[PDB]
Design an enzyme around this catalytic site. Structure first.
Site, short mmCIF file in Angstrom:
data_model
loop_
_atom_site.label_atom_id
_atom_site.label_comp_id
_atom_site.label_asym_id
_atom_site.label_seq_id
_atom_site.Cartn_x
_atom_site.Cartn_y
_atom_site.Cartn_z
N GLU A 122 6.22 10.46 -32.73
CA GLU A 122 5.45 11.50 -32.73
C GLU A 122 3.92 10.21 -32.40
O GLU A 122 3.01 10.86 -32.02
CB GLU A 122 5.61 12.11 -33.94
N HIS A 123 4.51 9.60 -33.60
CA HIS A 123 3.33 8.71 -33.48
C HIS A 123 2.77 8.18 -31.78
O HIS A 123 1.62 9.14 -31.49
CB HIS A 123 3.05 7.59 -34.22
N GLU B 91 -0.39 7.85 -44.64
CA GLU B 91 0.39 9.68 -44.64
C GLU B 91 1.30 9.42 -45.59
O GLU B 91 1.21 10.94 -46.03
CB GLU B 91 0.89 9.89 -43.26
#
Lengths: 49, 446, 57, 53, 423
Positions: free
Chosen positions: B60-61, B137
């Site tokens: 997803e990154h 994160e």
């Protein structure tokens, strides 16, 4: 990092009906409570006596 | 006066199609000038192993940082320049990439998704740049007590299973995950029959089908021999995880019993029950007068700062309960009341409260599916889970069927004399002992 | 194109009966969550986000 | 003034607890009987005829 | 294939009230009563009055008690909210189709028959403190509030939240006074979705004919300029730099809106570099790491504020503000390409269309349009109005910013944040 936690292994404390992942535990839910409750019932029956 | 009932029939049918790929293509036309499109894949941390956990999250990154045909920041500029919005998310069973865009931009929007979903570059320098972003994160996430507490709840409830793991993974996987680990996870999972191309707005089904055939044909032109894409069931465990931290100003607590899973019809009654209990937050107008006894008692006696019920569903299992936030000397009272309400519903639910719970579900259902994005997400993931769409009207009939009896029985089944999973974080000295919590799951007068 | 609030920028507070107290106009932050270390409490003397009165089955 | 508890909800409440209240009487009866050895009542149970005649 | 999409219907009554409805044929109904009663209408003797009001929507009314409003609304699954802006208050109600009547009646009672009983309002006072503490958990809210206090001598300078000294101090009479001097027919708009026009129209003529308050824009915000600095050791410095720009509804306001998208105003891609954001990219050049920047744009009835907002580590606030200001100077000086204005035009346009996609964003758009302009302006003509903005207009707007007296607010460790004269 709180994601580096992981609950430690309880295999050697677990009732055998559980112990296996892949298998849901709802299936042994009644039996395991059955046995532990029977124990108390019997006890109180005895104490009743 | 169109009646509510009538209006439910007015909602246009969701159109479904399949390419020879196995890729399902679904839409709900509405005549808006704007739309949402994207792809839903059933891949998520639950499919990962100890070793590659956090893989999808890593993709997803990378997902928006360059394909083969549009390397580096070329994606961004195509999207940004049309005014569209490009988002993505990953849960434990689902992953999604979608575009919000001007309806007449559907063609490129779709062209873009294919490119993302298929030709993701994963340039070695990028993955390295992302290593540190994700780690960051993680530090970031460690400060959200709520996120941490549900992660704990999953970790103890599904203790030796894949569902125990979080989506981001542990820091060491983020550190060691290599490109090959990613490409293998991708090949393993981003395969046609587990993807749904969904759209909602001023489009037409044929255009979307055409585009699906134009830009998506050629994914399962292969299809695997003995691969092994099956999901094993996840053992739920009656357990407790207590992260004591008296340096934190409020306690977070999340209790749950084992839910049935996405497919089970019991979910409708469970949600009706959950609506009755409701949620609460210290910024709600009117507290003493709130219908929910939990909510009103919590507001009058300041037992709480917030609380909410929940029904997380996964395949064949789930988490059904409530999470709350409170001061150090109120955990015991909050639990007593929360548990009194489950018991009460199990054995004693009345009719008018079920009606309120029912209506609350109707308003929630409809209030939610408002606008292209939420409807798209619903088409996309419904096909993943139910296999079909399930039109408003069917939900309406399910809800209508629920009455007091159904609440009592359905609640009893999942709640009554059941071993809960407890997760706690913070000033939790007053959190009740597990035996004590366990004894609150049944009533001696019953 | 009125609707100062959503014309993005000015601040717009919302109060509710059933839903939750909001403060949601416009400023940067999203691309502060990107180049990162934007902590946040979770749930310090607080409330709760995303809020409820939405769902499914 | 006990009319505060007179309405539909209270009637549904009364209903949901009938089986429970019934079964509690069952427990109380059998329990009183068995603790006093109710000659009258017991003489009718097949076994538990430990009073011959 | 959806049915016949109805047209919105719009009506001005001789008393000034405006009614606007759209039959959505949708499962639920949404209804709002928009009123020119926001914060800017408070003055120095009654600050906060409108915050407490925002918080009293469920106190008892003639016609419905507090307990009833709460249970009656929640028995049907509905909701009741109040949304405040410096210009207005919006009472919104939602529920399924079949229950609009009871929700309508609750709505009417709250907005035209509140009792403000002395003990109910006393019990409510401490909510002002909780409500304010929650909102001020975001540094943005303090900054934007100090921002407007510095920018104006009055009216728009007022905050959305009650000043602490006034908590516990706002009186029942002040609430009765605020309602009656502001919730009047000519300052109101009744908007409905999923309801018929004749039904809304009947309701307005029947229950919304009240007038005896003020009529003007009873202030006219006097832009003034200046700066407010709050030192606090948050980790990042939040700062906003602004100049007077255009009133909502002027063609110039549209130039500002496009200037805003040239410079940048919100991300489009999850975790993206923001390539097409000229502001971001210009700070990115000489600044390395945590930072955000975006154009800020606020337009009101008789004024407007436009500039930018920066979040950065304490030591580089100066670098960040100065690089950002320089980026605007560069477009005022004429360095702007047509393709950029064109692309900024597409985000504005797409963004507006996106903001009215749901019924709640439509309701608000129609309601604010009803109060601000006295009409409904459809998507094609808004688009057409954005289209008429010329490159030169955008340059002019930028020029107006660069040369106008400024206002600044900033919070954080300010040791390295420039004052205005140091810019």
């Amino acid at each position: 990092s709180h994601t580096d936690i992981k609950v430690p292994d309880f295999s050697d404390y677990r009732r055998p009906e559980v112990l296996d992942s892949t298998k849901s535990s709802k299936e042994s839910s009644e039996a395991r409570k059955g046995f532990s409750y029977l124990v108390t019932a019997t006890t109180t029956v005895g104490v009743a006596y | 006066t169109a009646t509510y009932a009538q209006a439910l029939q007015s909602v246009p049918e969701t159109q479904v199609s399949q390419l020879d790929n196995g890729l399902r293509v679904a839409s709900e036309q509405s005549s808006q000038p704007t739309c949402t499109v994207g792809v839903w894949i059933d891949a998520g941390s639950r499919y990962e192993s100890e070793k590659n956990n956090g893989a999808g999250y890593f993709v997803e990154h990378l997902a928006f940082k360059g394909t083969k045909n549009r390397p580096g920041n070329a994606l961004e500029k195509e999207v940004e320049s049309m005014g569209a919005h490009l988002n993505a998310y990953s849960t434990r069973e689902h992953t999604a990439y979608y575009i919000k865009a001007l309806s007449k931009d559907l063609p490129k929007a779709v062209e873009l998704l294919a490119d993302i979903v298929q030709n993701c570059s994963l340039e070695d320098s990028q993955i390295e740049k992302e290593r540190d972003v994700i780690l960051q994160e993680l530090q970031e996430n460690d400060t959200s007590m709520r996120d941490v507490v549900f992660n704990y709840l999953h970790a103890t409830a599904f203790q030796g299973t894949p569902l125990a793991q979080s989506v981001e993974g542990p820091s060491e996987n983020v550190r060691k995950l290599s490109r090959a680990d990613l490409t293998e996870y991708l090949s393993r999972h981003y395969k046609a029959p587990r993807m749904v191309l969904a759209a909602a707005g001023g489009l037409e089904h044929r255009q979307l089908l055409d585009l699906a055939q134009k830009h998506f044909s050629g994914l399962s032109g292969t299809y695997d021999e003995d691969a092994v894409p099956t999901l094993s069931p996840c053992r739920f465990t009656g357990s407790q995880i207590c992260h004591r931290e008296d340096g934190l100003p409020l306690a977070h607590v999340a209790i749950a019993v084992e839910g049935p899973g996405w497919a089970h019809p019991d979910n409708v009654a469970l949600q009706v029950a959950n609506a009755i209990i409701g949620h609460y937050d210290c910024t709600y107008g009117g507290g003493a007068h709130l219908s929910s006894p939990l909510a009103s008692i919590a507001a009058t006696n300041k037992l709480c700062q917030s609380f909410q019920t929940f029904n997380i569903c996964y395949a064949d299992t789930g988490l059904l309960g409530a999470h709350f936030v409170c001061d150090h000397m109120s955990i015991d009272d909050m639990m007593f009341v929360l548990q009194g309400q489950w018991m009460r519903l199990c054995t004693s639910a009345t009719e008018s409260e079920v009606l309120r719970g029912k209506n609350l579900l109707r308003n929630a259902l409809v209030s939610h599916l408002d606008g292209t994005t939420p409807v798209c997400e619903d088409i996309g993931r419904s096909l993943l889970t139910y296999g079909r769409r399930i039109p408003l009207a069917e939900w309406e009939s399910r809800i209508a069927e629920v009455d007091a009896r159904v609440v009592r029985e359905v609640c009893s089944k999942y709640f009554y004399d059941q071993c809960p999973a407890v997760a706690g974080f913070g000033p939790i000295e007053q959190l009740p002992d597990y035996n004590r919590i366990r004894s609150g799951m049944f009533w001696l007068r019953f | 194109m009125l609707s100062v609030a959503a014309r993005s920028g000015p601040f717009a507070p919302v109060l509710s009966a059933t839903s939750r107290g909001v403060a949601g106009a416009l400023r940067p932050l999203v691309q502060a969550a990107v180049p990162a270390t934007s902590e946040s409490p979770v749930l310090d003397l607080k409330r709760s986000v995303l809020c409820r009165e939405s769902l499914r089955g | 003034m006990l009319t505060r508890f007179l309405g539909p909800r209270y009637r549904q409440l009364a209903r949901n607890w009938v089986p429970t209240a019934q079964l509690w009487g069952a427990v109380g009866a059998v329990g009183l009987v068995w603790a006093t050895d109710w000659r009258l009542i017991l003489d009718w149970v097949p076994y538990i005829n430990g009073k011959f005649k | 294939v959806p049915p016949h999409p109805q047209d919105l219907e719009f009506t001005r009554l001789p008393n000034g009230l405006v009614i606007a409805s759209l039959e959505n044929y949708a499962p639920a109904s949404r209804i709002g009563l928009f009123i020119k009663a926001g914060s800017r209408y408070e003055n120095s003797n009654n600050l906060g009055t409108s915050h407490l009001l925002r918080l009293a929507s469920s106190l008892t009314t003639k016609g419905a008690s507090s307990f009833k409003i709460t249970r009656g609304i929640e028995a049907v699954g509905g909701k009741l909210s109040v949304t405040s802006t410096r210009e207005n208050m919006a009472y919104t109600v939602e529920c399924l189709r079949d229950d609009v009547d009871i929700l309508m009646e609750f709505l009417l009672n709250v907005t035209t028959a509140p009792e403000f009983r002395r003990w109910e309002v006393a019990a409510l006072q401490p909510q002002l403190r909780i409500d304010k503490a929650v909102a001020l958990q975001n540094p943005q809210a303090h900054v934007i509030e100090n921002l407007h206090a510095a920018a104006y001598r009055n009216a728009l300078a007022n905050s959305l939240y009650c000043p602490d000294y006034r908590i516990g101090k706002v009186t029942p009479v002040e609430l009765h006074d605020y309602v009656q001097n502001h919730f009047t027919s000519a300052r109101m708009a009744l908007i409905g979705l999923g309801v018929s026009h004749p039904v809304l129209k009947q309701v307005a003529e029947q229950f919304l004919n009240i007038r005896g308050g003020l009529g003007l824009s009873g202030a006219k915000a006097k832009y003034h300029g200046g700066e407010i600095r709050e030192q606090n050791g948050d980790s990042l410095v939040h700062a906003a730099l602004v100049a007077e720009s255009a009133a909502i509804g002027s063609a110039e306001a549209n130039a500002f809106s496009v200037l805003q998208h040239v410079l940048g105003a919100g991300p489009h891609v999850k975790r993206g570099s923001n390539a097409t954001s000229s502001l971001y990219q210009a700070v990115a050049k000489g600044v390395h790491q945590p930072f955000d920047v975006s154009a800020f744009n606020a337009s009101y009835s008789d004024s407007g504020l436009f500039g930018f907002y920066t979040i950065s580590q304490a030591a580089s606030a100066g670098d960040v503000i100065k690089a950002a200001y320089n980026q605007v100077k560069t477009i005022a000086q004429g360095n702007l390409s047509n393709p950029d204005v064109q692309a900024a035009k597409n985000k504005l346009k797409a963004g507006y269309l996106m903001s009215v996609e749901s019924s709640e964003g439509f309701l608000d758009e129609v309601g604010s349009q009803a109060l601000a302009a006295g009409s409904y302006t459809p998507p094609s003509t808004v688009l057409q109005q954005i289209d008429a903005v010329a490159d030169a207009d955008v340059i002019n707007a930028a020029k107006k910013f660069v040369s106008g007296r400024k206002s600044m607010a900033a919070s954080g460790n300010l040791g390295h944040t420039p004052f205005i004269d140091e810019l």
